[PDB]
């Protein structure tokens, strides 16, 4: 018995689409929900999807407010629709995936995913509400999340953070890390080995590790010295280089976190979606030293480290593929005499 | 059980709200109403009024389809407000009134027209609905319509034509003709002998009487011969005077639609709503011969005809106050010698 | 190299996207495309679909231009997608299809049918362009189109009409009547016998038999007479009772039209869509009969009579399946003491 | 001489509307007032509001300037109009009030208070302004603010907080603390004993007595012993139990303010209104204990455990009404043994 | 070969327009350009200008992304047009000037500053590019920058700071200061001696003299005692007075930020543009002292006392002129027994 006004009741009195009935008056003006209260129009919701606002607004109150896989690990896995309910992609403010499974009428390809249209589609389904695992085992292609463990299923450890209702968190009262299985034409994909983004923010960047604390609080010269990590320009590549009108490095969001501290710097993110690898058009605030398409990635200073430390350093340029997120990622490793020149996560 | 669904499903299955059950899929896009059929989108109603989208499109699907009185009678009269119906106004495309009773929960002032709200408010009833005379005779202020006689109250004999879903007729399989009846502060009022405009258009204008059937086939010469208006400025009046810049008279719907048969011109209508008096920049396409404010009403030639020959002409510039429609209207009447130059309703 | 200003280029000089080099330079606003000429913006393209405006500017610049079956058809016959084309719903001022294969980077989901994507949906083939007779040999769902005959393939005779650029017309100087193939899941299927609706117009229908001729210019009665159609009720049915408040019969578009020519009335196509059956809110401008869902279907005079004379007349109420423009179309008999009483295509 | 350049004039020269003469080109699109300086186009005003842009431009510009009382006090006394100014709601950024009286001839139901319109509304009157205490004594519906005594009327002292401009505040250059007065079918109320809520901000909340300074700096059970709250379930109601999925209690802002300094919160608005009571969706980011409908009301922690050490704890569940901002705030009152175990705003 | 696609590719890879060959699918959706990313569509623009979305976005990816004159600078300078470039305005979201020269083909004048369409047009020129000094030197008006000395022309020292991707800063690791030189009517003008505001930030102010690092740690009187500002009514002008309920004086950002350090108000920019002196109405949150028109100048201290020590003291009101960012500013002077009232830039 779905309707807008339906919808809009259980956004006012349940904060979320909770299957309750009953009915608000609501008002649409062009892409806003509203609703009255007290005599007046009270926004309740404002659709930047490129859906209509009536059913961006039905997808959002039906957004999945368990802790999620972020919505980078899910485009790295290939997802391309989720079973049953709506990962809501709060970087974009929009549906993680275009269409939906037994949602809402207007964006339903299927009802159930064993409909045949879904068959060649990744599905998405989560261990934690019955019968999924089962919908995984029959569907062609699909990712499936768990908590545990599922008899005869290899499983993949995945990132010990997940996105609660947008916020990023190592769950203390949830659990956020989950089990990973991934089936491709029928078959059990076996996931391959891989390191994981950290997903912090610049502005409250805490460090997770001794290492991480150590390169925030010394100074560049003895953190390199600490850490043995001579001739293998961390000067350039974490640091960063602000000498010149061009920005030198600064690939690492640590060293992003560890500038910040000290002065700021405009970051724009022109490409604004989650990814394993962000790209941003940088403005250094105190130098003016800039940079239009600096990758950045957020990975613990240790793997970064263990990385670069297990290259062959012999080669002038050479393309170094790492598993991060599931997804292989292309660095370009610069040399020079036995050391780094540079090692960034190649563009385009 | 009020849903934006629900309106649309009754639109698609019963072509207008029907108080059935059951819900359609539907995307609403700026000022469009869809609802997916075959897979692609059907447009079900543009919103060409200042409402939301959603509130002028369940208005529009609770419209009337009865016939009802023209909303020029309703407002010349004063109606504020419908008792339980939405009155649609076919020439603006919107609602004829502001506010619902029982109708919608966002226009909605009150459910039932006995809440105090509506007491000052002049409500108009329907006596061909279940009760509304008896809400009309409890109504402090109302307007109410009946196909027969009310006992006790004096009624007031309306126009021969209705509005029936935007088409003005008079019925044959329908009652169109109805009684008039106005309360004003719980008093019934006395309601003026009035004319009525015709309501004809140009391009299917019909004669309703031998006067009109002999303007029409017979020259400008031996009309005004044969119904002795000599004197009475006919030539300019209703034939119309197209031999300066400025387009004389042409007041009378009749003589525009003598007009339009010989040759075409442009009616801009930059006031576009139902009233007893419209005003048209005209430019007569044949001559250049062109009125910025051309003020036309169509009254049938003989009560025009009687109008007219109801006056003093012995002084330069005089008001004429005429009652059309229930309303009055001002007409300027300029005469010479005892002869009429010109006469016409008033504007501004 | 497909563009914004590539597809306005071609528009402006070719009519239609020709896949000419050239740009113009183009503003949107809104929904409107415009382009610079003379040094102001001349409007090239209105959105009235529910696609972004750029999107829907390039599938109407690349619509097909040759007589394609009208979309009642491809819908009946369930086309899900055209191969290298867009079929332009010109009653909907939209794409028929959802998505392409070919023709738009926006809406393709494949960019040859060849590809596994197609493989479930049913791709429209022209055998008009090369290679699109064996692209159907080898798919696995598919409706074809043929001028002529194909090695092996039984072919199902089309009907007579075509839409070439909106204009619904029996092609002198073009081929309108296609042979028609389909396949479901790889087997070439057997298409049912069907008749074929006419799509005439009401303002310019044209007669297509003598029996058409005599009903348009021959009296009730003497029409009934000369065809010994007594006890059919063609006086409800097709020539429709318009004595009471609710208009009777009046379910085909020959009645329509002869009625239009003695007095007019307004159609309300409530679902603007092209289909064998369309519904319309009628309100009969002379006597005020009205109806909100009348069910009209324009079938040749002499199919339609064929239809009701094969029809046992000895129960109350019955559903009558009939094979229409290749869709079962359910009507309704009611009948009394062996003859008809009422017949017409089901509502709902 | 009211008109939208003079609107405009009035906001670029002196910064809302002032009464001043003069005309500033103004250019509307979409939702946005511009105005041309040094050549280009800069923003005056976007419009938030469900009125048409140039209308609430006006009511904006028309704003009241001085400290007024907060939204949520006018809505908890029943208020629906303002005589001759705007109650912006910068909480909503739109007006407080549907229509005006003598502010703009767009939203005006009448120039003076005095209009029968008036009549049935509960008006907001300024004893500030000249001659508005008289409309008060003469206004059938009313809330009154005054700074001092009106002979005769029986004052009710309002909250030391107004809001200035957006601003809550308790003033110091200004009077923000004012006396209320409410009538009710033209007979003077007598408002209740209330207590107020402190309007403070999440982020910059300060300590209003030696009892909130010691819930802030001392820890949980040194605060609970020092006040003798054992039995009052403080450490689930205000401190909040982040130890289960479900987050626990979390009631008052000052517990919200505690847990805020230690670790960040999402605080989700899904009814962006000023209200006596909020209603979040919160989810803590340290743990991942969420919940869908936290109701938080801002009381100073001295009122707070006065009400909560009134109340009778032999009963399982029970009901609190305690007025607040002039309205009755229910209370759900959980508990066991003599002991509290819940005690929050009644959701719904 | 200029296109949207190819727009949105140097966008999405490039991070603004870099005239590479390529090109990405776009949806424009009202004022938002988006691309696919992932099959989901991800925001690359929203138009705030006037302008058409399309040609915003390309305006906006042309824009200069090298240190760039203030925009206040500009206008103060007269800049009509920058010759092929895009002075992009951060403060308003939109281009600094309506149109361009060999910029974009919707908003292009010419494509050559040399053609006779920009000779009355003040063209804004960069040495930094070849032949720009050369076409100022052809022009009739302009303003040029140049980071030396050009032969000839007699140079003006502009301000230490400039704009780099919307940051304003000193450049250490770019140049930032230019010379600045000015021709009207083919003739070279003398730019005058002038001071220059500081383009600071009221979060992030830094005092950039010992005297305003004394402003901010000293007390009001220890400052005015050890400068000597007895009499010159800083208490007023720069510390602000916030006793009455229209607040004193408050002209100087310094003393905005002082205040700011203390206790927070709202600034309101009711014309928000880059301007040397800058309109805000202000509402301390402390006391409740506001003003609708409140000037404020983003003067060195030392620079400031210097102007008012420079003034004669001997008359009631007058008007100083001052040239600060090569603009005259008037200033309203207010004196008393040979003591400073006030002095403030001139309202209007
Ligand atoms: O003829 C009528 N058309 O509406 C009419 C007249 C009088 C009535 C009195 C009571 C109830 C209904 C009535 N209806
Ligand atoms: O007559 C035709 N109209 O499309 C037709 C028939 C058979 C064909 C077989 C192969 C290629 C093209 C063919 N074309």
Redesign the interface.
Known sequence: ??????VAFN??????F?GQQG?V???????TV???????????FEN???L????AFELWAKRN?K?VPEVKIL?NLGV?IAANTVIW?YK?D?????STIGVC??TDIAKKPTE??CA?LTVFFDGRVDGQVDLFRNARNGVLITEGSVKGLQPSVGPKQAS????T?I????K?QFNYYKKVDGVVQQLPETYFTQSRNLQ?FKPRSQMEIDFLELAMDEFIERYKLEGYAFEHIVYGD????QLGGLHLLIGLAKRFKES???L?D????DSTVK?Y?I????????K??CSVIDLLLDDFVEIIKSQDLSVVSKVVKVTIDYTEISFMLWCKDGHVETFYPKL?
């Open positions: 018995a779905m309707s807008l006004e339906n956004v006012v009195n349940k904060g979320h909770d009915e008056p609501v008002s649409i003006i062009n892409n509203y609703t009255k209260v007290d005599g007046v129009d009270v926004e309740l930047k999807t490129t209509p606002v009536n059913v407010i802790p485009n391309d992609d974009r929009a549906p993680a995936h275009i009428s207007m045949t249209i060649p609660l209702n947008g916020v968190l769950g203390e009262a949830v956020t409250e602000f000498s010149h009108s700021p710097f405009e724009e022109f490409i604004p979606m790209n058009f403005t250094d605030a105190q130098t003016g030293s800039s239009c398409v385009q």
